[PDB]
């Protein structure tokens, strides 16, 4: 739904690196260079960042009326 | 409406719903999960079930302090108790007791306490459909954190259970006589040998065989620390002895570590499961470890594989060891030596890489040439068939000999391709090790992965159902070439073409269907046979008689020998006795 | 059909038991004579040896466990 | 592609069956006085014969 | 190999235990000791071997009170769930489809009068044993060829009131039958006042001048087309095969007496797939042995291991009453002697109504009824009677 | 001429990666089990009332994709996660399908 | 050899042995007896377990139980076998 | 309405209307493309469950249930299209004038 | 009143109140609960590799590699050679390449891009071994394993067969009104069926008292009084004191017998028809 | 008095007099309850038959559900009716005996020899006895005259399910249960046991219903499920 | 035919029962056995 | 508990 705070395999914080990576890739930059220069080197954290879906931007429209 | 006749009918009426079978209490059903740290006659149960199912123990003058301690702990503390039954017959619920600390001191001999399940309690553990008698066995309770029933990996074959999501049932006997009978007749370790034939049903599985082979091989050398780590999982403590190799560096060996557990008068000479290929040396002078030689409890050469410790392998060294040192030594051995196999397997590395299936490009060229030769032969057969020129096999007509010729040459092509693929592969890789040791896989699976799959067939014949005179619309009218009828010349590693995928699915669809029919027919036949042979008994004079008096056999079998106590359907193996006596000097 | 079938390889050896032997067998087994397995008097092998109702037929069969095994049958009318 | 009936979502599963207004021929059962059989299943506007 | 003094010691020590082991075991033990070569052996080893053999045999005996019937039923019915349809034809024929596995086991157990796909294995006499041409001739002599499968086309002419028959030469050539023989066979049918006139090399015509009816002419045509020309009834096709150094015939039909009547057939070695046929022809003991062999062959082919004692026991119980009986509705209810167990086997009230009408009585001798009402069974621990002396502490 | 040779498969068999390197029964088993996985089933799941519902907290789209995963919209309603898989024998707790 | 040699061997073997069913029945009866009254015939202080089943097994093993088994043959012959060593 | 909420259709058909399987996206997508054989479970016949060569491009060769319904419940292929039909009169007239 | 189902709890998630087109008040309450993976949960892949969790291992005890990466799931090699799923290993390699490179991977059948050789070369170029194997150390002892272990990024799915919804145990509770036998259903406090085949196993083991305990003492046990002459069931009233017979009145002696209550029901419903079953009694104690 | 065990079960056909004497009440009225008054006298829910709700005492016996076995009622049928489960048996009782004198239509001396053989072999060889009785029935059915009374007997054909239509030189006559019972009442005991039946426990005219037994409520309890009106069962 | 067989079976059972009670010795039992056999073999 | 007493 939203980016996990930490990588699942190793406890590395990865949530703070989502909004840069999600932007510069949309700007035409290849993901590998951005990931390397952001400080992500183990492929577990690369898996965490590369396969996020971010559904919450659609669920904010359909929220419990409580 | 449902009337008196309908009130007693079907599988939900009175006879099959409330008389032959019925719902009972003091039972549970739960998913099962593996646990290699339990004994072969133990079952792990969760805390919730242990605190719900209770066993009534009568208070005597011998076990009164323990029962008092049980009463002191409430229903919510384990171990504890749920109810206390006064000698008058009235029940007291410990949930509403104002102060059970004084009630514990108030009890005397004659009271009954319904305590929680504790370690060592005997329960009945079952897995449906319960085909045979050892599908329901007596196990000893061990309480562990979790939510599933825990079963040892060696206990699976009798239950025919694997951890794909299966559930099993547990029953708690509630009387002293029932508990005594279950403990004295239904214990797991007492039923290692199956009654169908003379051979162990509980034995080594798949990781155990690979670990045993890797530990027993000639080239294994262990240091003192490695030996201590391997032996830390067992109960063995004592003198290791001198290392097998003293200089330059002190090294033990796998056979020396294994030999610490064999009895000091055990002799065995026999081949191994790896002695089928080019390793067959047929005698003790073998450059390979393809012949097992044990003298006075010392393993001098040979490896352990499916033919030495595997389950359902009669006349193996495990079978003779059990037969000569009781289910007691059988259980001790299975509990102790079978864990070093796993420990050494995880001490070494056992994986499966894609490089164990790929063959060099020089092999693929030979496979292609063989395939082209076979296709040319089939084409020659077909071409000469269209103009007579065929001498049919005697007793067979034309158009029946052509199909036989085609099938024969395709099978020969498959065998040749498999041999070529096997020859050019690495003789020592994990897939080949699993295949030869009997852990998992077979030669056919290796052939299909590395070389061509072969000819797919439906009901024993080539795939023919489809359009008129052709299976698919991708082929010409009236084509009986090998490709057009379901011959797959590719491998799983190489990948299949679309029509080859279709032919493979068409060939394999029958397995998804036959299972339900087979199980239903088996159930019906077994029910009839049980109802026919239910009331037969063996008298004190050896005869087999029905409970109504009449005689079926003058003496059971022909020599009054139980199949369970026989040496693989044999009263006694005289060669085995001669070996047991004088095998240390052969 | 005059073909003799007593020499077929599926046919064990049948013999007619004497009255003394039958009496000893019945007393030692503690049974009534009709509690043994039955054989019809019209059976081809029983007819080949002239078996009559009320007799006891001793049958010797091949066996992989003891070589030869001996069983008994009671001749009933039919 | 579904319906909302009483709040629930219901779907009509496609049903595959033999063609109706056609003639199907076959051999008769072995050991019977009938050698060959033909069958037609005419479909009307409400009933099938 | 063995010293003569040692051999005398062997005989002396073996003659003292003749009454403690079966005779076959005594022969096997004696032969095994005589085959010990390359190793010197003393008298202590011999004593140990003999004592161990006797003790092992004694420890391998069965225990009175065993519920052997349920064990045998479970040992036979458990492999039935692991059967597979791995094969669809004979060993090396690729035709003559066979039924093995679970359906064949059910057919044997249900005691069907006629098996699905009956077969026969015919051995040849010593004179005809090693001749392929003779084996082929004998196989061809009994294939049961019919008129319908040697003609190309048949025509009916109501204008001439006649039927024209045209023969395919190739099939007529391989069947080994001439036109004159077929003409004689047709004349032997006694169809009425008829006449046959030749038309071609392999074609003739019958005129049926007696009959004047549009009906029954097609009936006569069909009767002619169904006429046998050679072979024995029941056999569909026979195939000559080589087993060892001899030639055998595998047959897709079953007719035991007809084959016994055929010249050149070894009557004392013929084996058939049909159990009722051999039961009626050879006897009940032959049927018992055939049932045992059939069950063993069915189980062995699938690769499943079952002890022979279970098979012998089920074969014995199946042929107890002097003839083969179905083990279920006719082998349970036949010797049930119980109403509740029979009424619980199949869920019906017909048996209860019959028992009430005939005023039958139940004795609760078996195990199912005792479990139903709630009494202990008389197997296992129910066979044991205990007596105690409480006064002696 | 065939428009798409891979279009002989269904809508669930089109999610298997490299389906031509597996045995035939495995793909049928995969279809049966993929009809049961947990994940997001609708965007407005919080306002609709279903008798039984499941929600995966952090679903991820597959790293190894197929051409039909994006067409059917599976990348927007994923039902799983990517796991670092090791292939080895360890402690005997993964024997026999576990 | 009354009827067969194998039957004589069988009866001779089982003349002085206890089948597992007899052992189970004896243990069950003794365990039921100890559960109510019936003070043990052994020293119940060195025993590892204080439950009735273990005491019954130990008493049977030591051979102190005054229990006899009657085996009634199909022809009416009866045989008395005693478990006390004495 | 009573026909849709129960599935008991006219002509003796049963189970035609079923509740939508909204476990996930793939469950709903597969449910909306299922095809059930009418003449089924009355006998195996060992031939209605075969993979006929005519199914190429029309039914998925993998997505089938396991058990009694194996080979009788199928799923549409990717590009398959069920025809809707026209009136026979115009075809008859054009055939006659041809 | 509507109550929460037995054996399951949660947190009230939503409450809705509306009208069903006729003025009737309709109330809906949705309750949620949290499910954390545990031993017994079922997982699967896209290649037919279902299985349950055998144990959960911490990060310290996992076999870390030379870069500190620990596996998320460990899969036994022995499951591969028999099932013959090469696509599993191919997907593992492809996923590792996709995570390393950041490039898209397409695995459509017959048209896979990139090929395996290109992916392996690129993996080697990015600092990892081409065969997707790694050097692994033991997390418990620190000893380097003698072999290399294959690592991948296979995609996994969680199925709705959770162990938290499959446990059910019964000690005692409600019984049927007719047969007086334990009820059926997890929500009805439970009850397990003891079929015929389990009874056959018990008979095969030859345990009479265990059979009696399983089938009689723990279900529908009852005591009934039988007349000594007609054989029908009498009773024992609380007027003052009497063993009374339905036909003999007070002129017969009645004996009590313990029996399954289902058998008594069978007798009663047999007398509903014209069948007359008379029970013949016998001595409990065997004289001699 | 001593505690006993069940040793055997003796079956049979329940006598109408025995049904009358085992019953406690006679069911006369036709309404199950009035203004929810299930204890209405003479109904199927009469409290004298049994009690099923927790708090109540049975009128017949001062016992609650714990110790109250069900009590049977009786209904006096005004027109005899035939048991559907027994029809085949009475079929064999119609084609194997004379309609007028009610005796087997086999002559005297061979019938006496047959019954002597049957009694001498009844218990030792039950299968042989069954064969003997089936042979006797077959040879008695195929006789069209009664030697005992010298009368010519017609034939009866069975029509499903329960109606027997006898042929009487044309104009097939439908048979009534009353005359069937009258015919079956005349068969002597010595001849009914020869056919494989028991006269003292299964008498053929008891096989024709004149009084019907009423099962207690404990066999047909009223279910109050769905939190609404109680739902009665089919019985 | 069938009735003669049943009488044969009954008489054989009676002779065996009498012999088992020691009412008559072996030789007269054998004479009765084969006398019954010959007497009832005429019908067969 | 039974007696089976007789005189
Ligand atoms: Mg499983
Ligand atoms: Zn990470
Ligand atoms: Zn070698
Ligand atoms: Zn009475
Ligand atoms: Zn009452
Ligand atoms: Zn008359």
Residue numbers in the entry:
A (entry chain N): 1 to 66
B (entry chain A): 295 to 880
C (entry chain H): 7 to 84
D (entry chain B): 148 to 196
E (entry chain C): 1 to 393
F (entry chain B): 638 to 735
G (entry chain K): 1 to 86
H (entry chain B): 393 to 490
Paper text:
RNA polymerases (RNAPs) are the engines of transcription and an important target for the regulation of gene expression relevant for health and disease. We have applied single particle cryo-electron microscopy (cryo-EM) to characterise the structural bases of RNAP inhibition in archaea.
The high resolution enabled us to identify five prolines in the cis configuration and an additional zinc finger domain not previously reported. Compared to previously published archaeal RNAPs, our cryo-EM map revealed a sequence register issue in the Rpo8 model starting from loop β5–6. Interestingly, the chain retracing led to the repositioning of the conserved GGLLM motif21 at the interface with Rpo1′, as seen in all RPB8 subunits of eukaryotic RNAPI, II, and III.
